[PDB]
Write a protein that holds these residues in place. Structure first.
Motif, short mmCIF file in Angstrom:
data_model
loop_
_atom_site.label_atom_id
_atom_site.label_comp_id
_atom_site.label_asym_id
_atom_site.label_seq_id
_atom_site.Cartn_x
_atom_site.Cartn_y
_atom_site.Cartn_z
N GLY A 285 -9.08 -2.93 -6.16
CA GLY A 285 -9.14 -3.50 -4.81
C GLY A 285 -10.50 -4.07 -4.44
O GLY A 285 -11.42 -3.96 -5.23
N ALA A 286 -10.61 -4.67 -3.26
CA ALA A 286 -11.90 -4.93 -2.65
C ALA A 286 -12.59 -3.64 -2.22
O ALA A 286 -13.76 -3.64 -1.86
N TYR A 287 -11.84 -2.54 -2.27
CA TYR A 287 -12.37 -1.24 -1.87
C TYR A 287 -13.43 -0.75 -2.85
O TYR A 287 -14.48 -0.26 -2.45
N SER B 273 -9.90 -10.13 -3.04
CA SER B 273 -8.86 -9.16 -3.32
C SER B 273 -7.48 -9.80 -3.63
O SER B 273 -7.02 -10.73 -2.92
N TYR C 172 -9.75 -12.30 3.15
CA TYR C 172 -8.85 -13.17 3.92
C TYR C 172 -9.20 -14.63 3.85
O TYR C 172 -8.66 -15.43 4.64
N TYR D 184 0.86 -1.22 0.00
CA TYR D 184 0.00 0.00 0.00
C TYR D 184 0.88 1.24 0.00
O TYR D 184 1.93 1.32 0.69
N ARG E 292 -5.29 -2.92 17.77
CA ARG E 292 -5.15 -3.91 16.71
C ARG E 292 -3.76 -3.86 16.09
O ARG E 292 -3.36 -2.84 15.52
N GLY F 195 -2.44 -3.25 7.37
CA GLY F 195 -2.04 -4.62 6.99
C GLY F 195 -1.35 -4.80 5.65
O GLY F 195 -1.96 -4.56 4.53
N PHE G 275 -4.43 -9.95 11.79
CA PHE G 275 -4.62 -8.88 12.74
C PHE G 275 -4.97 -9.51 14.10
O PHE G 275 -5.55 -10.59 14.14
N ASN H 7 -12.12 -8.61 10.14
CA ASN H 7 -11.20 -7.58 10.49
C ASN H 7 -11.98 -6.63 11.42
O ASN H 7 -12.96 -6.09 11.01
N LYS I 22 -3.78 -3.19 -5.73
CA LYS I 22 -5.18 -2.64 -5.75
C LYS I 22 -6.05 -3.28 -6.91
O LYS I 22 -6.64 -2.63 -7.75
N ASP J 176 -17.76 -10.12 2.41
CA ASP J 176 -16.41 -9.62 2.19
C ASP J 176 -15.40 -10.69 2.68
O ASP J 176 -15.16 -10.86 3.88
C1 LIG Z 1 -11.94 -6.68 5.59
C2 LIG Z 1 -11.32 -5.89 4.46
N1 LIG Z 1 -12.08 -5.60 3.29
C3 LIG Z 1 -11.58 -4.87 2.16
C4 LIG Z 1 -10.16 -4.36 2.23
C5 LIG Z 1 -9.66 -3.49 1.10
O1 LIG Z 1 -8.95 -4.27 0.19
P1 LIG Z 1 -8.23 -3.67 -1.08
O2 LIG Z 1 -8.15 -4.74 -2.05
O3 LIG Z 1 -6.93 -3.33 -0.54
O4 LIG Z 1 -9.02 -2.54 -1.53
C6 LIG Z 1 -9.28 -4.61 3.43
C7 LIG Z 1 -7.85 -4.08 3.46
N2 LIG Z 1 -7.43 -3.80 4.82
C8 LIG Z 1 -6.56 -2.73 5.28
C9 LIG Z 1 -7.22 -1.38 5.01
S1 LIG Z 1 -6.40 -0.37 3.75
C10 LIG Z 1 -6.41 -2.93 6.77
O5 LIG Z 1 -7.38 -2.92 7.45
O6 LIG Z 1 -5.31 -3.20 7.26
C11 LIG Z 1 -9.90 -5.41 4.57
O7 LIG Z 1 -9.19 -5.72 5.74
#
Ligand SMILES: Cc1ncc(COP(=O)(O)O)c(CN[C@@H](CS)C(=O)O)c1O
Lengths: 419, 419
Positions: B99-101, B242, B214, A63, B395, B35, B337, B183, B253, B211
């Protein structure tokens, strides 16, 4: 109905893009529809991505900073600070996005609330209207129109009606979107047209959104001028660029918005909860691209300088073979698209079995199927009631290998030669 | 006032990421906060991005398919089809995103309208709430709560009130979002827990957004179980993955959502007017990375299988030194985590010079600046009314080189001082 689209996507269409990707896969024409190079971009940009993937630093592929990779944004502020002749704050006045596309998205979602009227110029880049509508905004369209017809013409000939433009502004005008160099005309706005838009923005307290993705491809003897440079405009301009158009690496999808931090804060709120961050090894590679160019800015071999002349010869070449076949080409002042008026061929082509509502769609699909040359319909870039202004035209991209350009010229020569 | 945040972004504040990433950039701590691995991800994927950059194919670095890179979507279809034990259309039932974002964004924006209620389980990944609010929806929260007080505990001990889950579901409920592995807790949901959600979604006709970034990080003897594989659940679930997490390349991403074509069409529409398409060479590199792992899905050498074993040792090491020091660690069933109650130690810290309103915020800031160790405050994963539930926790991320997990144990051991 339960799981239908939310309301804010009322008018919600597939892009003209899909259906022409499908047509080009089926018939495999000589493809003048894709707005990217047939051939490879400058190596050094390319080499930098391979280096960032191969890097010994474990975090090169992890990241990075959400508002822009540090090395990226330092280089952006360096380049733009010189061009806009003020110092741009890399941390607060520059925002890096998933292409100029997501920059357009953060801006429109950040500054258009339910009922705000946004002024859009036709033909528009495709995302403009659906983004305005999804934000709850109300689009106000005004078309650029050739101030002549027949052979022989320039993108400066396509102009707004000044009185029309004027009447479109009132105390409800939130925003105007200007695109220069223009897609797909190639029109580069001159100082007086920018001045026109500037003076209306100051009167009406309007935010100007400036899509300057083709900033570096203005042809002699024309020149790109940034509206955030005009008087009082910095405070009311978000200017948008793209790495994909700057370094001819459109599959990289990194762009930026720059402007005062007051304007940019709005983009940031949208951005952090839309994508949060962009790809590190790509932004890293672009930062090294910009650093390579920043060392030799005044120099002819600088890609920002060189690319115009590389294109111009293909610009001139295409305008020639399209005039030869019986079209009237609009010679672009910048960029790599050309709009040509094919309507005097409409007695020489059989559109009978073509079923689209609009004639440019018929014509451009017939040409693919019949003689193996693909272009794009410009009416896909107008509001429904103005679609009639694009039906006599076709969009071709001349960012192509010299040999593929020559094949298009003879597909056309041999189509004419008999008929 | 004109250029204020639109109504739907009213009360928008910078995320904890924009703030703690800037904190980490400032005081240069041991970063057990956001993370990511502090060491190299699989060499075959990194090699695949280098090759994509250096490719003689000139389409490798130009735009690819808007809903996803053909080679990628096929690989994602091959794999999840096996995992869900049905045939997933790569074309209509898979969307690649930034990303998953963005996969969460295109889901929420595509399925939440004005007044639609969404169920969010606390502590939740912090993007979920502001995204439902940006879409116009009403978040309804329910906390998970540990059922024992010593010790040490498991994330399986963090449970939902079943009566109070049921209560939340009504005619207005559009969406529930589950995250497993979870998370920040590491909680992997068992079959009774997912059946409890599954039955209520079937009873009220609700949409389950799963979601599952992981998904490959579940420790023995627990198991990752996919909600869309439950009965009648496919037709009403969007599952998110992701490549940042699957392959430990967070700076790439790239993510995805798969589910029925009906529910995915909404997403495609949001994606189309947001970013339009994603990075070509990266998706090419991820496609090859799946092609590699598909050849060996049951091998210890497979990263989908190796990574749990690799993280379990680090997780046992960390749980060990956090306990040793005085904190009450929750031992996670999956992910990297760990939540620990640190309140046994507030006589042993001084939070009086931190400006933050929440104690875990003050705690985690002081640690960063004073002792050089960064964690993340869990109250940022609670709705305002229930932020008091995360104040006593912290965390950390145990996705590190042993030498830095040692460096972190050593920091806690000396900071434990004698006072
Ligand atoms: C449960 C969960 N769902 C979606 C994402 C985002 O994934 P991306 O592919 O990076 O967009 C994360 C990525 N976790 C980082 C936040 S930048 C953290 O909490 O350490 C996640 O933990």
């Amino acid at each position: 109905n339960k799981f239908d689209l939310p309301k804010r996507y009322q008018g919600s269409t597939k892009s003209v893009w899909v259906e022409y990707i499908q047509l080009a896969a089926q018939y495999k024409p000589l493809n003048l529809g894709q707005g990217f190079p047939d051939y490879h971009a400058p190596k050094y940009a390319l080499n930098a991505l391979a280096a960032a993937a191969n890097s010994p630093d474990p975090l090169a592929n992890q990241y990075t900073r959400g508002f822009g990779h540090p090395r990226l944004v330092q280089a952006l502020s360096k380049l733009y600070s010189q061009l806009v002749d003020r110092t741009i704050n890399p941390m607060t006045e520059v925002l890096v996005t998933v292409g100029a596309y997501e920059a357009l998205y953060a801006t429109i979602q950040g500054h258009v609330d339910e009922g705000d009227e946004v002024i859009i110029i036709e033909p528009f880049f495709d995302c403009y209207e659906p983004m305005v509508k999804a934000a709850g905004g109300i689009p106000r369209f005004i078309p650029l129109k050739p101030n002549k017809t027949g052979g022989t013409i320039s993108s400066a000939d396509w102009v707004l009606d000044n009185n029309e433009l004027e009447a479109l502004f009132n105390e409800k005008t939130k925003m105007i979107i200007i695109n220069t160099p223009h897609n797909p005309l190639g029109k580069v706005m001159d100082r007086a047209e920018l001045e026109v838009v500037a003076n209306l923005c100051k009167k009406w307290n309007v935010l100007c959104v400036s899509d300057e993705v083709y900033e570096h491809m203005v042809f002699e003897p024309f020149e790109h001028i940034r509206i955030c440079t005009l008087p009082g405009m910095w405070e009311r301009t978000i200017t948008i660029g793209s790495a994909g158009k700057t370094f001819s690496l459109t599959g990289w999808k990194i762009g930026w918005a720059y402007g005062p931090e007051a304007l940019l804060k709005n983009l940031q709120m949208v951005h952090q909860n839309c994508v949060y961050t962009c790809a590190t090894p790509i932004q890293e590679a672009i930062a090294v691209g910009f650093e390579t160019e920043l060392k030799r800015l005044k120099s002819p071999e600088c890609y920002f300088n060189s690319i115009s002349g590389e294109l111009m010869a293909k610009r001139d070449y295409m305008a020639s073979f399209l005039a030869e076949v019986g079209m009237n080409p609009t010679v672009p002042q910048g960029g790599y698209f050309m709009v040509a008026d094919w309507s005097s061929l409409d007695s020489k082509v059989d559109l009978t079995q073509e079923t689209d509502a609009r004639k440019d769609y018929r014509f451009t699909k017939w040409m693919t199927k019949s003689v193996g040359l693909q272009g794009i319909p410009p009416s896909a870039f107008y509001s429904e009631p103005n679609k009639h202004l694009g039906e006599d035209f076709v969009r071709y991209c001349f960012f192509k290998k010299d040999e593929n350009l020559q094949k298009a010229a003879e597909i056309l020569r041999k189509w004419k030669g008999s008929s």
